[PDB]
Subunit: 348 residues, 2 copies
């Protein structure tokens, strides 16, 4: 598709690089640092390159009205969920060091101004902005002024609303990625609309394109890689029997490994051009292509025609099936045996 | 992508229909009708809709030169392989009835004029033309005059060489499909070039598009579905420990089931548009979007500014984050408490 790219630390991202899978532990640790470490361990052992957290500072993230609104995948207020799962600054700093001590990249999604400022102090290599904040222009202006690349999910937002955020990002001069997304825990296959990735790349040609996903399996993400996706995102848990509203659509070590393997295979198979010559096909072309042969015993002097000529494998004959009709009208320079390949010396 | 379509018997094929998986037993039965039936049974029990055979009449398919050429995946001449695996007319008729007795569709790839005529007598619902015969124009003219839809693989052929075959097909007035393909047993991921499907659809807008595959797994085909493929083809065997040159890249009942499941999921997830409104996202939009709030206690009379205003979740406030800046300059109609959502009655 394109040659756009940028780096998250020492990791290059873009169409011409290996797709990057972001393992979002998010709020899956339910506020326990111990659980968070067990999930970081599972990600590390599964071969993850990036672990993504969610930075929640409830007071700066939402007003009192949030204590009265229930999310689609929960039974209590969003305020109660975030307050229950939120890690204080101290613990989050410990989580970042822990992930890095494992040789992995740590990034986190900020949901507020205070969160963004905390992450800037921690000096993360890139900032993720969720679909909920894709239209929070003032917050995006703040994050872009940090000087690091931005990864923006675009669920729940139209191309036009997104253009305002991208304009702000360009103005700041930092590279960015746009992840197509559908924000429903979980998301049915029918609502995915992988075509959205194309719409985004067409509208924003300088953007790295990817997919953030909330379906129950790897199919959507694998399709995203086939279409040209460079960044894949799925919630991640060490085991499926963990409690939590996001566990339902989370991938686990086993499913992460499958996704990584499939993404690699599709990275290799995607794109390319129809007319490209594949050397490995040579031996097949040599025996599978047809050559012109006598379909009847032809006496010297007789004229060749579509009545006494036909075509058969292999393709080493003097005349290819492509020249079949050009032999019509020619005269046999000698007797031609039925079934024999017509050779140049066979025509006067 | 498009609304092109046609029927293979009572089965509709096209972008707006469920992708069709063709199970190619081909020469996997090694010339044994008993083995062929065991493979047909395995396909049936796995849920296959179509079983594809290969019709070999060695004398009309190749000249004596073929007894001296070895294919890439074999150690003996192509003539010896075909002669060893070929089913006579009697047995092939029995195979067709057997497949149909199982409620499945039977089609077969012809490799010669004699093969095409035999299949016409059997009256198959559609004709498959392999990549080896994609450039065999005289043979294609013969098959097109039969009046049934044609499925043409295009491996080893450039867009220009393919246009000659398509012209012949249109001239005959029958619907057709173009399958991208790479003819190497097996095919590495890197040689797949899924982009070839796009090239084909762009060049031939009236063609149903699909993929014929020879890789070691389902990844290539799943990627093809994500891109818009309507027909998938893989060699098929009842078990992987069967002898034969094509068994290496064949799928088996278990892998067929996985492909069918994935193709279904990707049929649902592919395409669509970014701007489409997903009803299921409503509850998320209501709590995730931000509203304007007082960032400072504002005394009546004071002017609102980016210094004493900010934005926070949820999205039920009188002023959305989109209107943040429009409040700059307004005058507080009364005292505004820090953290409170700015309401219409809050400004004079
Ligand atoms: Mn998510
Ligand atoms: Mn094949």
């Amino acid at each position: 598709q394109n040659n756009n790219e940028f780096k998250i630390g020492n990791r290059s991202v873009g169409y011409n690089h290996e797709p990057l899978i972001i393992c979002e532990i998010g709020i899956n640790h339910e506020g326990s640092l111990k659980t968070a470490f067990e999930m970081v361990d599972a990600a590390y052992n599964a071969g993850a390159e990036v672990v993504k957290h969610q930075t929640h500072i409830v007071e700066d993230e939402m007003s009192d009205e949030a204590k009265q609104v229930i999310p689609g995948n929960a039974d209590v207020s969003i305020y109660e969920i975030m307050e229950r799962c939120a890690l204080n600054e101290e613990d989050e700093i410990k989580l970042k060091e822990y992930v890095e001590s494992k040789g992995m990249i740590f990034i986190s999604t900020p949901f507020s101004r205070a969160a963004a400022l905390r992450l800037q102090r921690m000096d993360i290599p890139a900032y993720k902005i969720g679909s909920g904040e894709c239209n929070n222009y003032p917050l995006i202006k703040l994050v872009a002024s940090f000087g690091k690349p931005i990864i923006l999910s675009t669920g729940m937002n139209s191309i036009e609303s997104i253009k305002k955020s991208v304009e702000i990002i360009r103005e700041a001069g930092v590279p960015y990625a746009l992840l197509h997304c559908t924000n429903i825990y979980p998301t049915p296959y029918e609502d995915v609309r992988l075509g959205g990735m194309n719409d985004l790349s067409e509208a924003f040609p300088d953007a790295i394109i990817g997919l953030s996903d909330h379906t129950l399996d790897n199919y959507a993400c694998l399709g995203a890689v086939a279409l040209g996706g460079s960044i894949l995102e799925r919630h991640f848990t060490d085991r499926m029997d963990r409690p939590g509203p996001d566990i339902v659509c989370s991938m686990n070590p086993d499913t992460f490994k499958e996704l990584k393997q499939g993404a690699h295979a599709l990275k290799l198979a995607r794109g390319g051009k129809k007319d490209t010559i594949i050397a490995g096909e040579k031996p097949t072309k040599d025996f599978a292509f047809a050559s012109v042969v006598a379909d009847k015993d032809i006496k010297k002097g007789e004229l060749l025609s579509g009545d006494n000529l036909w075509v058969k494998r292999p393709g080493n004959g003097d005349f290819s099936v492509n020249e079949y009709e050009t032999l019509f009208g020619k005269v046999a320079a000698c007797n031609i045996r039925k079934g024999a390949q017509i050779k140049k010396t066979d025509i006067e």
